Curated annotation (Swiss-Prot), chain D:
It comes from the Viruses. Binds to host ACE2. RBD also interacts with the N-linked glycan on 'Asn-90' of ACE2. Cleavage of S generates a polybasic C-terminal sequence on S1 that binds to host Neuropilin-1 (NRP1) and Neuropilin-2 (NRP2) receptors. Interacts with host integrin alpha-5/beta-1 (ITGA5:ITGB1) and with ACE2 in complex with integrin alpha-5/beta-1 (ITGA5:ITGB1). May interact via cytoplasmic c-terminus with M protein. May interact (via N-terminus) with host bilirubin and biliverdin, thereby preventing antibody binding to the SARS-CoV-2 spike NTD via an allosteric mechanism. Glycans are attached at N19, N71. The lineage of its organism: Viruses, Riboviria, Orthornavirae, Pisuviricota, Pisoniviricetes. This is Spike protein S1. Attaches the virion to the cell membrane by interacting with host receptor, initiating the infection. The major receptor is host ACE2. When S2/S2' has been cleaved, binding to the receptor triggers direct fusion at the cell membrane. When S2/S2' has not been cleaved, binding to the receptor results in internalization of the virus by endocytosis using host TFRC and GRM2 and leading to fusion of the virion membrane with the host endosomal membrane. Alternatively, may use NRP1/NRP2 and integrin as entry receptors.
């Protein structure tokens, strides 16, 4: 291990002159990838199951604190409906599900890597297959059989351990199939009508002329594209190939989407572990305290444990609200970027 | 439709609900024998009533801190919404923005702001075409052994004659020398067709 | 109650290999989920009983009073209710039959009739399934269905065809965004 | 009982890569080793040489002493005022 | 009575809008029987410590190991009135329902 000063970049000097200008003679079609989180994991917390754990003497003093459980439940439902609204505003921006025409000569451009391929289920492109296979969801919120938790607990099955204490993950509203259908409809719209379907009715237009107008938007004449159409198509195909190769080779491309669910799972795990804490009491199990000490004396320990668990739940809810605000900001940015880059040509 | 200002209604509804639950938290018994401090002071001695007073103070401080945290989160959300609204005002009312789906759905022409309590209402006037028609197009025109490209329009054909018109409107015109430009021969274009050009 | 450890659990008789000096086993949360019988040398795990959340889909009160019951994370073909007057009573209401049960990936829903038709999502439930109070079943009740993503459209794409509008329509849209909230002050000694 | 978990504990253990003393006794007249809050004994003999240990403060009749002896069929552990000699051994 | 009244009590209102609007409750299956399994041993020799003529010295206090017995502490209450019966880890009425 060696220490060094960070390099700000390669040293460059522009040959500035009052009568010299630089004009390129060729170009290169480059494609970049940008990943932004849209939604997070929707989780619900049970008050009496996490604080008491099916105890008869318990849950009688917890009701004396007020509506803390009701406030936490309302906050969790608000987070859930907020994530659902974010998903709806990000993926359901259009109302017409446009179908892609049969694969023909699209001016030399090959969209087979992005168009949905019916050879595999869920009707999504191989790029989306790789993107779904890279990120490993800890809990998708789907239904789990009761027999899956009984026995074979040697594996890292923390989902059962967290569900046994009232911590469960709710499934999202829009499934992956609907998201893939929305993506395919948006792709078909943007390849068959350009930016006309976003502002109104879908106006069919050939892809060569569409790309010629795209180049005219930035300041490139249509004849340059009409004389180098095959070159542009080959460069686009090579760029798509390089992008898919980098996505299949580099596993650190979806790092943000991985860290989101990693932080969610870590928060769930530490919230489960907080039950093993001894908030000034003689033990962490309420049944042991009830069986050892008398109720008049065990009430102090029960109150201490209830206060500690309520503080832990409030900290968890505060962290979940901060993460939900960050995810809402990210989803709004992603929806704006979608509407400005896919549904039209932005000069930003 | 009364459900147009649902967001502005839910804001003050959540504020009133937070105020109501913060008031109701005073009736809670945070491990004490009663929720009234005067009753505890009149029933128990100060050395024993101090524990109940401390418990009530801790409970009420926790409730106040939760309320303040929720108010700060709501204030951050309202600040984000107000910044977005101010940017949208400055970009749609004070000028013409080319951002898609920002100043409403469609080609934004102009906007009109409206005053609202704890909010703002924008009237986005957009350009929405209708009753479109299909036409035959061509990338270029080859008349004098040279390719003629549209300067600012698009070549169309009604079936037998070729014309030039814009995108957002159907205004067919004769192909002349001032509406097109020559660039290269007719062998670089793929779907170029032969058509006469007026001089 | 083996050695004073009371609670609620179901014995499963797993294949855990306990050591002679070990009788109790705790999980990450220090909850004893496996114990050794004092009399018999067999190993018995302590697993919690049926647990899960229940949501009640409620339509407009001014419209009707018929509501549905949803059991999140529960399978319909395993335990629909499975109580007879001598079980838990947090919700003293039992819906046994009536051709209203339907299995979803989010849980078991009771009180809705699943139809093959697709409409707009009215009441969000989960797993892309939503409910609505339709009056085309004529009687009216709550039905469950898959949300409709939109009308199916197909663009007549061609290498030599283009669409150019001949007219236009001036449309005006409304957009409401919150700007400010209620400014409140809290007194410490008075509260 | 724990399985497939990572448990943290703080107690008297043997540090890893710690310099331990290896005795080959052979030579008699070896003073008693100190008991620094726990001792780690290990041996690989197969002739039943080491079959007991002693514990105490001064190893005499003035203070108490722990006598642990392991026989071929039983074990005897007694706490008494044993007068340990300079070189205690079993005959 | 019915889920409608339950969600009304949850929302603390007589009118409920369209949709779930809240989480009703959580299902928790209760117990139906009891399973007790103490050990099977002989009566504990509590007379060796209580019904004794003379104890030992203070510096030579004798420690009596107790194991493999049914500790019935109810026989101690009928003795002479004790000066101070204070337990620092449990309640004096909970010894009979616990193991050691």
């Amino acid at each position: 291990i060696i220490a060094y000063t960070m390099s700000l970049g390669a040293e460059n000097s522009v040959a500035y002159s009052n009568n010299s200008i630089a004009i390129p003679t060729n170009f290169t079609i480059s494609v970049t990838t940008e990943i932004l989180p849209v939604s997070m994991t929707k989780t619900s917390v049970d008050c009496t199951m996490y604080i008491c754990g099916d105890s008869t003497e318990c849950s009688n003093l917890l009701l004396q604190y007020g509506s803390f459980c009701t406030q936490l439940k309302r906050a969790l439902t608000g987070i859930a409906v907020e994530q659902d609204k974010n998903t709806q505003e990000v993926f359901a921006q259009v109302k017409q599900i446009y179908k892609t025409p049969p694969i023909k000569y699209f001016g030399g451009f090959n969209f087979s890597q992005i168009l949905p391929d019916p050879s595999k289920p869920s009707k999504r492109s191989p790029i989306e297959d790789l993107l779904f296979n890279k990120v490993t969801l800890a809990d998708a919120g789907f239904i789990k059989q009761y027999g899956d938790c009984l026995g074979d607990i040697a594996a890292r099955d923390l989902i059962c351990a967290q569900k046994f204490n009232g911590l469960t993950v709710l499934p999202p509203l829009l499934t992956d199939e609907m998201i893939a259908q929305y993506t395919s409809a948006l792709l078909a719209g943007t390849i068959t009508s350009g930016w006309t379907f976003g502002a109104g009715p879908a106006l069919q237009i050939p892809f060569p002329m569409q790309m010629a107008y795209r180049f005219n938007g930035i300041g490139v004449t249509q004849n340059v594209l009409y004389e180098n159409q095959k070159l542009i198509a080959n460069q686009f195909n090579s760029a798509i190939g390089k992008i898919q190769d980098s996505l299949s080779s580099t596993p650190s491309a979806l790092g943000k989407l991985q860290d989101v669910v990693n932080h969610n799972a870590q928060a769930l795990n530490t919230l489960v572990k907080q039950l093993s804490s001894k908030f000034g009491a003689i033990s962490s199990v309420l049944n042991d305290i009830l069986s050892r000490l008398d109720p008049p004396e065990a009430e102090v320990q029960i109150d201490r444990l209830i206060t500690g668990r309520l503080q832990s739940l409030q900290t968890y809810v505060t962290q979940q609200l901060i993460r939900a605000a960050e995810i809402r900001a990210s989803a709004n940015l992603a929806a704006t970027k979608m509407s400005e880059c896919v549904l039209g040509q932005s000069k930003r | 439709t009364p459900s147009a200002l649902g967001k502005l209604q839910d804001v003050v509804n959540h504020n009133a609900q937070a105020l109501n639950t913060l008031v109701k938290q005073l009736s809670s018994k945070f491990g004490a024998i009663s929720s009234v401090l005067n009753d505890i002071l009149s029933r128990l001695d100060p050395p024993e009533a101090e524990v109940q007073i401390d418990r009530l103070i801790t409970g009420r401080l926790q409730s106040l801190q939760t309320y303040v945290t929720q108010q700060l989160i709501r204030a951050a959300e309202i600040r984000a919404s107000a910044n977005l609204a101010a940017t949208k005002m400055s970009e749609c009312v004070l000028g013409q923005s080319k951002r898609v789906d920002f100043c409403g759905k469609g080609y934004h022409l102009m906007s009109f702001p409206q005053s609202a309590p704890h909010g703002v209402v924008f009237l986005h006037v957009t350009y929405v075409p209708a009753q479109e028609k299909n036409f035959t197009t061509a990338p270029a025109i080859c008349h004098d052994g040279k390719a003629h490209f549209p300067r600012e329009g698009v070549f169309v054909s009604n079936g037998t004659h070729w014309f030039v018109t814009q995108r957002n409107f159907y205004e067919p015109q004769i192909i002349t020398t001032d509406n097109t430009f020559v660039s290269g021969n007719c062998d670089v274009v793929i779907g170029i067709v032969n058509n006469t050009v007026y001089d | 109650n083996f050695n004073g450890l009371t609670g609620t659990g179901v014995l499963t008789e797993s294949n855990k290999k306990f050591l002679p000096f070990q009788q109790f086993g705790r999980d990450i949360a220090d909850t004893t989920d496996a114990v050794r019988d004092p009399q018999t040398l067999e190993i018995l795990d302590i697993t919690p009983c049926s647990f899960g959340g229940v949501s009640v889909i409620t339509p407009g009160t001014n419209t009707s009073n018929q509501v549905a019951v949803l059991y999140q994370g529960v399978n319909c073909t395993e335990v629909p209710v499975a109580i007879h007057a001598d079980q838990l009573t947090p919700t003293w209401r039992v819906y046994s039959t009536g051709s209203n049960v339907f299995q979803t990936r989010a849980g078991c829903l009771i009180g809705a009739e699943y139809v093959n038709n697709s409409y707009e999502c009215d009441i969000p439930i989960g797993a892309g399934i939503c409910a609505s109070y339709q009056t085309q079943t004529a009687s009216q009740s709550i039905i469950a269905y898959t949300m409709s993503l939109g009308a199916e459209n197909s663009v007549a794409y061609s290498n030599n065809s283009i669409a150019i509008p001949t007219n236009f329509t001036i449309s005006v849209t409304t957009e409401i965004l919150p700007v400010s909230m209620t400014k409140t002050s809290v007194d410490c000694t008075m509260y | 009982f724990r399985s497939s978990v990572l448990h943290s504990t703080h107690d008297l253990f043997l540090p890893f890569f710690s310099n331990v003393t290896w005795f080959h006794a052979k030579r008699f007249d070896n003073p008693a080793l100190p008991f620094n809050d726990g001792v780690y004994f290990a041996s690989t003999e197969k002739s039943n040489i080491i079959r007991g240990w002693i514990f105490g403060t001064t190893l005499d009749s003035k203070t108490q002493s722990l006598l642990i002896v392991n026989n071929a069929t039983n074990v005897v552990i007694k706490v008494c005022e044993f007068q340990f000699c300079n070189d205690p051994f079993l005959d | 009575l019915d889920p409608l009244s339950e969600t009304k009590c949850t929302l603390k209102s007589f009118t409920v809008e369209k949709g779930i609007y809240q989480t009703s409750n959580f299902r928790v299956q209760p117990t139906e029987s009891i399973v007790r399994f103490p050990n099977i041993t002989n009566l504990c020799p509590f007379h060796e410590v209580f019904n004794a003529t003379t104890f030992a010295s203070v510096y030579a206090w004798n420690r009596k190991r107790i194991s493999n017995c049914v500790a019935d502490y109810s026989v101690i209450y009928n003795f002479a009135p004790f000066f101070a019966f204070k337990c620092y880890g449990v309640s004096p009425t909970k010894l009979n329902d616990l193991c050691f």
